[PDB]
């Protein structure tokens with residue numbers, strides 16, 4: 001019954017429950033969730049989200065099918081990769097869950113859209129090996145061979161997430177109609193493929209056009225009256241969630257920074273041993289963590305969240321303010 005209540009075994013049910021009081025807040029601490037869930041933050045958080053949104057009831061998903069599926073998905077996240085592990089997946093899922101409740105996006109999305117977006121967040125980095133697409137391509141890896149060099153990892157994450165539905169008692173979409181399943185599959189593919197950084201400038205241009213053309217209901221919510229507008233918001237939302245580390249509390253952000261750099265430097269080490277050129281930010285002998293975080297925010301993270309903020313204005317004002325404070329803290333840490 002730790003299991004019926006939470007995703008998972010804990011023993012530390014009291015502390016776990018306490019952390020999960022922050023389920024609907026940007027300030028939830030996923031590192032604490034992992035510590036109190038026997039390191040199953042992704043199973044735990046997904047279960048809590050799904051109960052909070054009543055999705056198990058709406059889509060006739062038994063608890064046991066859900067947990068079996070989530071534990072399997074979670075087992076396919078590599079625990080020896082410093083950043084792209086199930087902690088990151090749990091964070092993006094939880095962050096997407098919070099974005100979906102933005103007041104300006106109230107009752108805009110259907111249940112199935114909500115299901116697709118959270119599922120997409122959960123699966124979006126599954127079986128990540130801890131190296132970039134470019135590394136896999138340049139080392140002639142099997143994955144790059146499978147996917148003809150194109151969004152290699154993102155294609156793989158989708159394939160794994162969807163293949164795992166076929167394991168015994170894992171079919172969480174068994175009681176959707178055929179058409180819901182087709183629709184959700186289309187949405188999920190769209191969202192996960194959108195997480196490829198090579199598409200970031202396209203997503204952002206489309207987001208800016210949504211801002212420039214936005215329409216507000218009498219009730220004060222955004223009017224999104226076709227599928228194209230809806231999926232475009234959703235894919236930008238999961239992209240935002242994926243790029244949300246610098247907008248959390250500084251104590252959280254710093255831990256995420258430490259892990260992404262540890263992962264980068266390990267790829268740099270493999271590049272160095274093979275005699276390759278070392279990818280940007282991957283050489284531990286020369287990289288500046290601080291310049292790199294401030295560059296990343298200035299060129300990628302702030303323009304995205306600023307545009308997100310303009311779309312739901314003023315509902316992301318506090319996220320934007322925290323990003324800007326964290327950016328200035330890292331800036332002030334640049335030597336000289």
Ligand SMILES: [C]OC1=[C][C]=C([C]([C]C2=C(Cl)[C]=N([O])[C]=C2Cl)OC(=O)C2=[C][C]=C([C][N][C](C(=O)O[C]3[C]N4[C][C][C]3[C][C]4)C3=[C][C]=[C][C]=[C]3)S2)[C]=C1O[C]
Pocket residue numbers: 195196197198242243245246256257260280281291292293295296299300
């Ligand atoms: C926490 O933290 C973090 C977090 C997170 C992160 C992310 C993840 C991911 C991956 Cl991995 C992947 N995909 O697909 C997705 C995702 Cl989501 O990534 C990103 O996004 C990137 C990676 C890579 C790039 C591009 N390039 C860059 C550079 O290279 O850069 C240098 C130069 N210049 C000088 C120095 C440095 C800076 C500048 C850039 C460019 C331009 C600008 C900026 C950046 S993007 C990061 C981070 O950190 C960082």
Ligand SMILES: [Mg+2]
Pocket residue numbers: 124125153195196
């Ligand atoms: Mg990814």
Ligand SMILES: [Zn+2]
Pocket residue numbers: 088092124125242
């Ligand atoms: Zn990710």
